[PDB]
Write a protein that holds these residues in place. Structure first.
Motif, PDB file in Angstrom:
ATOM      1  N   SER A  55      58.663  47.425  43.783  1.00 35.34           N
ATOM      2  CA  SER A  55      57.475  48.222  43.471  1.00 35.34           C
ATOM      3  C   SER A  55      56.157  47.504  43.789  1.00 35.34           C
ATOM      4  CB  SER A  55      57.498  48.697  42.015  1.00 35.34           C
ATOM      5  OG  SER A  55      57.493  47.605  41.115  1.00 35.34           O
TER       6      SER A  55
ATOM      7  N   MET B 149      59.259  42.354  42.377  1.00 31.46           N
ATOM      8  CA  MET B 149      60.273  43.359  42.699  1.00 31.46           C
ATOM      9  C   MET B 149      59.755  44.326  43.776  1.00 31.46           C
ATOM     10  SD  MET B 149      60.296  45.225  38.955  1.00 31.46           S
ATOM     11  CE  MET B 149      60.922  43.719  38.211  1.00 31.46           C
TER      12      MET B 149
ATOM     13  N   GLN C 298      70.683  33.437  34.345  1.00 35.98           N
ATOM     14  CA  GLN C 298      70.317  32.664  35.534  1.00 35.98           C
ATOM     15  C   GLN C 298      71.550  32.339  36.374  1.00 35.98           C
ATOM     16  OE1 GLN C 298      68.231  28.360  36.567  1.00 35.98           O
ATOM     17  NE2 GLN C 298      67.531  29.441  34.724  1.00 35.98           N
TER      18      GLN C 298
ATOM     19  N   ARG D 142      58.078  37.740  37.848  1.00 38.78           N
ATOM     20  CA  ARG D 142      59.129  37.895  38.851  1.00 38.78           C
ATOM     21  C   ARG D 142      58.931  39.180  39.663  1.00 38.78           C
ATOM     22  NH1 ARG D 142      63.954  35.228  39.384  1.00 38.78           N
ATOM     23  NH2 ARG D 142      63.627  34.314  37.303  1.00 38.78           N
TER      24      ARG D 142
ATOM     25  N   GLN E 106      69.504  46.343  38.440  1.00 39.34           N
ATOM     26  CA  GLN E 106      68.754  45.226  37.877  1.00 39.34           C
ATOM     27  C   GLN E 106      68.772  45.281  36.352  1.00 39.34           C
ATOM     28  OE1 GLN E 106      64.664  45.233  39.200  1.00 39.34           O
ATOM     29  NE2 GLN E 106      64.181  43.246  38.265  1.00 39.34           N
TER      30      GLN E 106
ATOM     31  N   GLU F 151      59.944  50.627  36.018  1.00 41.50           N
ATOM     32  CA  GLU F 151      59.557  49.359  36.636  1.00 41.50           C
ATOM     33  C   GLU F 151      60.765  48.589  37.170  1.00 41.50           C
ATOM     34  OE1 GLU F 151      57.856  46.233  34.093  1.00 41.50           O
ATOM     35  OE2 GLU F 151      56.223  45.977  35.539  1.00 41.50           O
ATOM     36  N   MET F 152      61.918  48.804  36.545  1.00 46.83           N
ATOM     37  CA  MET F 152      63.139  48.063  36.852  1.00 46.83           C
ATOM     38  C   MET F 152      64.223  48.994  37.402  1.00 46.83           C
ATOM     39  SD  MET F 152      65.074  45.528  34.171  1.00 46.83           S
ATOM     40  CE  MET F 152      63.694  44.382  34.174  1.00 46.83           C
TER      41      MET F 152
ATOM     42  N   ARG G 133      53.336  42.005  35.039  1.00 44.57           N
ATOM     43  CA  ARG G 133      54.646  41.921  34.383  1.00 44.57           C
ATOM     44  C   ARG G 133      54.652  40.743  33.420  1.00 44.57           C
ATOM     45  NH1 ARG G 133      56.618  44.793  38.366  1.00 44.57           N
ATOM     46  NH2 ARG G 133      55.793  43.181  39.781  1.00 44.57           N
TER      47      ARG G 133
ATOM     48  N   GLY H 193      70.632  38.965  45.908  1.00 37.22           N
ATOM     49  CA  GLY H 193      70.552  37.921  44.882  1.00 37.22           C
ATOM     50  C   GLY H 193      69.461  36.889  45.108  1.00 37.22           C
ATOM     51  N   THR H 194      69.508  35.815  44.323  1.00 37.63           N
ATOM     52  CA  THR H 194      68.505  34.755  44.391  1.00 37.63           C
ATOM     53  C   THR H 194      69.065  33.449  44.962  1.00 37.63           C
ATOM     54  OG1 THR H 194      67.320  35.687  42.466  1.00 37.63           O
ATOM     55  CG2 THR H 194      66.805  33.404  43.063  1.00 37.63           C
TER      56      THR H 194
ATOM     57  N   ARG I 185      71.959  35.293  38.548  1.00 37.14           N
ATOM     58  CA  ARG I 185      70.797  35.314  39.452  1.00 37.14           C
ATOM     59  C   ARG I 185      70.945  34.351  40.630  1.00 37.14           C
ATOM     60  NH1 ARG I 185      66.043  34.607  34.835  1.00 37.14           N
ATOM     61  NH2 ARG I 185      66.283  36.647  33.810  1.00 37.14           N
TER      62      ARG I 185
ATOM     63  N   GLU J 201      62.184  29.980  44.021  1.00 38.64           N
ATOM     64  CA  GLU J 201      63.258  30.962  44.138  1.00 38.64           C
ATOM     65  C   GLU J 201      63.016  31.947  45.271  1.00 38.64           C
ATOM     66  OE1 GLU J 201      63.770  32.655  40.219  1.00 38.64           O
ATOM     67  OE2 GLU J 201      65.072  31.007  39.577  1.00 38.64           O
TER      68      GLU J 201
END
Lengths: 387, 387, 387, 387
Positions: free
Chosen positions: B331, B329, A221, B327, A206, A201-202, B326, B371-372, A224, B359
């Motif tokens: 998938s 992604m 964060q 944020r 990440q 999933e990740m 599950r 990134g965010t 992030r 975000e």
């Protein structure tokens, strides 16, 4: 030419049956009609088997009758040929040896056929290759404990041991992924063992982001939204330095089959050495096809994976929404089984307060106690610490 | 050959009229003289119609007289032929059915004639084409980078660049439409570039209402329920004034194909100049037909659209309900791909608290970091502001 | 013959790719291998595309290799032919123009092919026709507010406006059909507008019977069991007289598709003029096939129908048995969505006492308030009156 | 040769239609196009039927048109042949007689065809036979009360009567099988009637073991674990002696279809005489295929079985787990219907104390009362006794 064959032995097998009907049992065990090179012998052996399956006596008369009704008597040489077969057997008791000779020459013909087939495909399709070699592999064959880092969890388990299938189930947001990563991180950085991580999933980066934060104490964060204190940055270089020496191997393939997992771990252990396998949730692993029966086979396969590589396999699992209907228990994964039997150790993660503390309920353990180990979770670093 | 015809039915129609004069009314309604394949029948039917228009009785004598005066009697076979017609009708009452058969075969001949005509023009004039296809249509029917305005997003992207396919995916209610409109609004009002907006779910006025509120700081619900403070009204006039100078072109066609999008943008760039293309969600664009393969082609086509017009294309996308499982992604749009490869930049919108903050997760960027970026959302004005 | 072609342009396209690999992008956008008239060029273009999809450099060597492995080199003229192609391009930068010439001549061949195909079918199948013309239409293309009469409902709505999709949902026996008919009757008899009514469950005469009773105040059961007071009969003649002047068009087709609805309304508006569309319950409309996804598309299509003909569309809907489990709300049609978004106005009919009074709950309205309008129902005449 | 035919009669039928269109109705009732021996007549009759199905008048002109469009006119001899047909009919009113002659000769050809087919299969497949005879049977055809022993149950029922379908439903472990066996045992041993027992879940010897224990009072577990008192053994010989004289016929086929049940009972009644049919639970009977609709047909078939053999049919049924959710009632088998209508008598077995007493609830009886008859059950002997 000429194709490997033994007409003499074929004749002795069929003859034997006509001399002693009991000879068909050993012959049928070793041979099927198609093993006979001569078409007439295939038809004859097939007639014998048909008569036998009806529970009728297999002798010269019933086989003659059988072939007459299937319009095959003349084609196989008549009853006169069946007489010759009866004269072609040195001793009926030796039927297994005669049979094995026939079989041996059948296997050789199959080897020659598949080998030729492979050779021909080499010139034709050219035009793939990776598939060609794999089916060439396939076709030829056919012719034939570990300390966790959490002192209190180590007390009960001792800790995670070789050949054990460990299942860590938790509802979404509880922190099962973080838990598995902490263990994988503790093993690789503290002990000299290699950890294989499958994150379906990740992604790989990440996931490294989360164990970098966990490692050197960097606010999650903060990365992030980056952001980053100049010395929180120097904190990152030490995290990388120490984390580079660790034997962490990650495969972030979206939805692998168990065979791919197995093959990769297989190569890894005999190439660098393997100590743990961590799989980021089981319900994402796809079956051998293209889902209750499917999930049981995967479970069963992961246990086989643990035994083979003599390594603890940690497979994360997700709980049904039954807990919220009720603290998790065995029935929550039993509606999604049959992981319950295959796992020699089943662990649940319960958060008392959804205290930034988290409970690790060991519901099953084949060799050792059953109870709740307690750890503290830090959201800012995505870590589990002792107590 | 031979051309679709029915002499028997033609004969029965004319015969019917000679047996019952009332039969001409149904026949004339369905047929004109030219529908008759045989020239004699055209002349005869035409004589009947002439006699009828004079209000004179249509029978064998008056039709004979009519044809004699137009020097056509012998040519059509004399009165003797008119007698045969009278013998050629099974029942005069069935004249409409006889008539429809004649008509059916006339229409077929016209289809064949126009189709042949089109085919021939294909070889001749060659030498136009656009006119050819249009008259072929006609004839067949007759038979029947760029600054975003968000300083922090501009840091990472630099900003949205020419030829790039930008995909902004978000779950419903997160605010992807508002996000795309803010960018489109910032570009058109701040920079001298033109923005092309395709809103498939939302109408043109319904969309302008949202960017008027965003522009001059007018409470959204205030307009919806109107309501309106006298000076919140003067706030609207300044919003309009400043928004009128902007080069914003909106197409609110319910469900366009990519070819229509492409053609419109094509004309726009070479007519006024184009800088951005914004499409209000991709899953609404219909394919070239009349849905996984279909969506990949659209994705692939939007990237081709970006390259052609050397313009950033912002296509909104909707996320599967996996995030809630599950944020967001990669998938989450991969189960709805294959937009993942075609997009050189994929952005997700995540709302930490569904803090009126939102975000912007840049999951993919071919030339630049990942990134965010964080922005604040104001529900009352439907705006995204800096931080 | 000879079929429209341009070998020179085909040669220049392929040549361009061998001179500048970047030329394949523009070429592949405009052409597919089959557009090439010469078989060798199809094979060559196909080899290029394959190499490209692998992310491998497309040049003379890799294309040669590709064709060698697919056993097509000699067949296309060898590497020697690939050299000629490279010499056949005036300037690689002009590849789009060369490409368009190839495409133009491909489209012409398709036009000729389909036109010939139509001509041939004209002689063969003869033997249908209605299908023939429709597929001939199809194949050629491929080569390329209103006052309601209820003063209190008019206050809130203002009233039913052009381009709006209005959905009136109600449980069985509540009186949604009677409600829709009253509105349709008020519009046609009072205003100069035409109303199109689709009754899928109820026949045309069975529906007129109900609006005759409603019109001239005739007891419904009185007609059903007839019965009829001599002056209640004279009441019928006045009802007919006044109802004959109204522009009411009814289609009582059991289960139409949305395309049939659309086409009929389409013709009507441009022939006589159209003002309203009323559809007797949505769940009866069948999809484009032969049911949740199916119903969303119909909903989406009805909204598109409203926008196209600039007319309010009133679609009746039936509520799930959830209300009885609870006064209806949005969730009762949400389990049967996604009509909730497409509708810019959703109305529920609630009967307080199942007072012969009925409540009209306007749950959604995009431009205007939300509340309950109240009307009185008369069972004897099947009417809704003011209050 | 020559195949049975009547060209003259075929000609008269078609002719009749051309003289009087009303003649087609009688002809189409008796004949289909394939009954005509001559191909032209098939094509002609088929054209007539097509025109007729369109609601269009069938005469010489429309049939000519129809055949022209299907490209069959010349092939059938033109309109000139259609004229001859019209001259070939002595009197149109006699069309049914002409038609019957055509039909008669069609049936004969089918008889000859199927008979020949059977004869040929006799030489070919030889190689089965049992299937051959059955399909030969099949193909040729195609060318064309009782005292129960429980005094209190006898009061209400009177007792089980001929042609009645009796259904005895009970939850598992209640004792429905034992109940049915007691009745079957009482009838066969006490009265001179024969009982046919179908045990689908229990074997023939396993069932006799239970009625031997019941008969001579032998402890059930005593036999199971054997064990056996010397005089409890002499008790067995008397049980056998008395039970040998009884007319008990058992079929312990795992999962029969109703047709097999019917055929066996059919032969039995006309060979030895039949009085009762007992079937050990209905839900085990498999359908005519390879389950709610399936069970209704079986129910319906068992009632037909009762009527045919003029015998009471006792079919055991199992109750849904609804009783435990509540004493059984009709709704418990209604969720598993539609056995409720077909059964003219439905009985439930309820055990007050799951008192070794059991209640027999007669919920339905077409001719007689409705109530509860009470009996005592003895676990040790598996018997039901009076009270």
């Amino acid at each position: 030419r000429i194709p490997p064959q033994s007409i003499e032995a074929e004749q002795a097998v069929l003859g034997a049956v006509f001399l002693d009907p009991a000879a068909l049992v050993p012959a049928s065990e070793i041979l099927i009609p198609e093993d006979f090179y001569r078409a007439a012998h295939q038809k004859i052996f097939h007639a014998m088997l048909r008569v036998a399956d009806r529970g009728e006596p297999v002798d010269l008369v019933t086989v003659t009758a059988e072939l007459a009704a299937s319009e095959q008597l003349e084609e196989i040489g008549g009853v006169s040929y069946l007489s010759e077969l009866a004269d072609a057997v040195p001793t009926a008791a030796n039927v297994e040896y005669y049979a094995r000779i026939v079989e041996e020459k059948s296997v050789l013909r199959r080897l020659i056929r598949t080998a030729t087939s492979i050779a021909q495909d080499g010139y034709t399709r050219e035009d793939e290759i990776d598939v060609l070699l794999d089916e060439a592999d396939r076709k030829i064959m056919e012719v034939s404990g570990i300390p966790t880092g959490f002192t209190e969890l180590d007390r009960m388990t001792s800790g995670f041991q070789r050949s054990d299938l460990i299942i860590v189930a938790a509802r979404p947001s509880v922190g099962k992924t973080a838990f598995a990563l902490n263990i994988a991180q503790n093993v690789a950085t503290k002990t000299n063992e290699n950890v294989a991580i499958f994150s379906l999933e990740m992604s790989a980066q990440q996931l490294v982001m989360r164990m970098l934060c966990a490692e050197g104490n960097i606010n999650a964060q903060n990365l992030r939204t980056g952001k980053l204190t100049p010395e929180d940055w120097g904190k990152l270089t030490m995290a990388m330095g120490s984390l580079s020496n660790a034997g962490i191997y990650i495969d972030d393939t979206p939805s692998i089959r168990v065979s791919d997992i197995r093959a990769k771990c297989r190569r890894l252990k005999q190439e660098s050495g393997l100590g743990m396998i961590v799989i980021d949730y089981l319900q994402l692993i796809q079956g051998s096809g293209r889902r209750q029966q499917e999930v049981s086979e995967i479970s069963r396969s992961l246990k086989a994976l643990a035994r083979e590589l003599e390594v603890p396999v940690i497979a994360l699992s997700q709980l049904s929404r039954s807990v919220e209907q009720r603290r998790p228990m065995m029935s929550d994964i039993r509606e999604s089984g049959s992981i319950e039997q295959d796992a020699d150790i089943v662990a649940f993660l319960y958060r008392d307060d959804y205290k930034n503390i988290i409970e690790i309920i060991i519901a099953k353990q084949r060799n050792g106690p059953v109870g709740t180990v307690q750890l503290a979770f830090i959201k800012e670093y995505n870590k589990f610490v002792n107590l």
